[PDB]
Design a protein around this ligand. Structure first.
Ligand SMILES: CN1C(=O)[C@](O)(C#Cc2cccc(-n3nc(C(N)=O)c4cccnc43)c2)[C@H]2C[C@H]21
Length: 321
C-alpha cells in the first residue's frame, strides 16, 4: 500500500538514503534522481550531477571491458571512489540488488546510484590493486598457491551470493578486484546477476563470457548457482595457464557442449587435490558439479597441501602455456 508513496518521495531527487530505498527507486529505472549510501557522497540541493557535484579524475583513465569505470571525486567532500557508467535504457536492477545491503569483504561495496539523463552512474569503492585480470597479464600466470588463494576467496563471495539466491552470472578474472597489497579479493560486475527462486536464454538477457560459460547455459538447459562454479574453475585455469580455456585449441560455444570439460588443460605439475578440485567444479551436469561451499573447502585444503600461501603477490614473470 504505502510502497507506492515511498517511491514517489525518492523520485525527482538525489538523497542520502539506505540500500532499501535505492533498490525500490532503481526498479523504476529499468531527471536527476538517485540515492547515495554514504556520507562521503552528499547531494546538494536535491541534486548530484556530473561535473558539478562530482568530477571524473583527470585525465580519464578507463577500466572495465567497455571503459565504463572511472576514478572520481566528490567535489564537496573530497572523497574518491569509482563510478560505473550504465546506459539507462539497458540498466538492470539486479546489478544493484545483488550488492545493495550486502555486507561482505569478498564483495565490492555499493556506495550509491544516481540517474542523470541517459546514464545510470553507479558508485562503488575504488580498489588500487586492479583486477585479477590485470594481474594475470602482468605476471603472465600465477603460481599454484596464489591461484588457489584467490579462487577460494572468490568462492567465499559466491557462497554469500548463493545463500541469498543470487547468481553472479559472469565470474572471471576481470571481475575479481584486489586490494593494494593483493591479500584480499572481491567480486565485481553484477551486471549479469539474476535473482533465483529455489534457465537463462529468454529475451531481455545478456550472458557472460564465452570461454567461462557452462554447458547448460550453452545448450539452453535449466541453470542454477552451479554455473558460477564452472566459471570460477575456468577462471582457475586462466590463472594457472595465463590464457582462457579453449582458446589455444579452437566458434567456441560449439565445443563446450560437445567436448568433454577442459580438464586436460589442468596443468600437470599441479598437486593432486588442486587438479581434483578443479575437476569437481567442471562436471558438465550441474547435479554432479561441486557447490560453492564444497569447492571452497577443497580448494582450501589444496592450498594447505601445497604449504599455504608462500609466493609473493608480485614475484617473477612466468611465461604462459
Ligand atoms: C558495487 N558495484 C559493482 O561491483 C558493480 O557491479 C561494478 C563494477 C565494475 C565493472 C567493471 C570494472 C570495475 N572495476 N572497478 C574498479 C574499481 N572499483 O576501482 C576496478 C579496478 C580495476 C578493474 N576493474 C575495476 C567494476 C557496480 C554496481 C556497482
Amino acid at each position: 500500500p504505502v510502497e507506492e508513496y515511498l517511491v514517489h518521495a525518492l523520485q525527482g531527487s538525489v538523497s542520502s538514503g539506505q540500500a532499501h530505498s535505492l533498490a525500490s527507486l532503481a526498479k523504476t529505472w529499468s531527471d536527476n534522481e538517485g540515492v547515495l549510501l554514504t556520507e562521503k557522497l552528499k547531494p546538494v540541493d536535491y541534486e548530484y550531477r556530473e561535473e558539478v557535484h562530482w568530477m571524473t579524475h583527470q585525465p580519464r583513465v578507463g577500466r572495465g571491458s567497455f571503459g565504463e569505470v572511472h576514478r572520481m571525486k566528490d567535489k564537496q567532500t573530497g572523497f574518491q571512489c569509482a563510478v560505473k557508467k550504465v546506459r539507462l535504457e539497458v540498466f538492470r536492477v539486479e546489478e544493484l540488488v545483488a550488492c545493495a545491503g550486502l555486507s561482505s569483504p569478498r564483495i565490492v561495496p555499493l556506495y550509491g546510484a544516481v540517474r542523470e539523463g541517459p546514464w545510470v552512474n553507479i558508485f562503488m569503492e575504488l580498489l588500487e590493486g586492479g583486477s585479477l585480470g590485470q594481474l594475470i597479464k602482468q605476471m603472465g600466470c600465477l603460481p599454484e598457491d596464489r591461484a588457489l588463494y584467490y579462487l577460494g576467496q572468490a568462492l567465499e563471495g559466491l557462497e554469500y551470493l548463493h545463500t541469498r539466491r543470487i547468481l553472479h552470472g559472469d565470474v572471471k578474472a576481470d571481475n575479481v578486484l584486489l586490494s593494494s597489497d593483493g591479500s584480499r579479493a572481491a567480486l565485481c560486475d553484477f551486471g549479469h546477476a539474476l535473482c533465483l527462486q529455489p534457465s537463462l536464454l529468454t529475451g531481455d538477457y545478456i550472458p557472460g563470457t564465452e570461454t567461462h560459460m557452462a554447458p547448460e547455459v550453452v545448450m539452453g538447459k535449466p541453470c542454477d548457482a552451479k554455473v558460477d562454479i564452472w566459471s570460477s574453475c575456468c577462471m582457475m585455469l586462466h590463472m594457472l595457464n595465463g590464457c582462457h580455456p579453449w582458446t589455444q585449441y579452437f566458434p567456441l560455444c560449439l565445443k563446450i557442449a560437445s567436448e568433454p570439460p577442459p580438464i586436460r588443460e589442468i596443468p600437470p605439475s599441479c598437486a593432486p587435490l588442486t587438479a581434483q578440485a578443479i575437476q569437481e567444479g567442471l562436471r558438465k551436469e550441474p547435479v554432479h558439479r561441486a557447490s560453492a561451499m564444497e569447492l571452497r573447502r577443497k580448494v582450501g585444503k589444496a592450498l594447505q597441501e601445497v604449504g599455504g600461501l608462500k609466493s609473493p603477490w608480485k614475484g617473477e614473470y612466468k611465461e604462459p602455456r
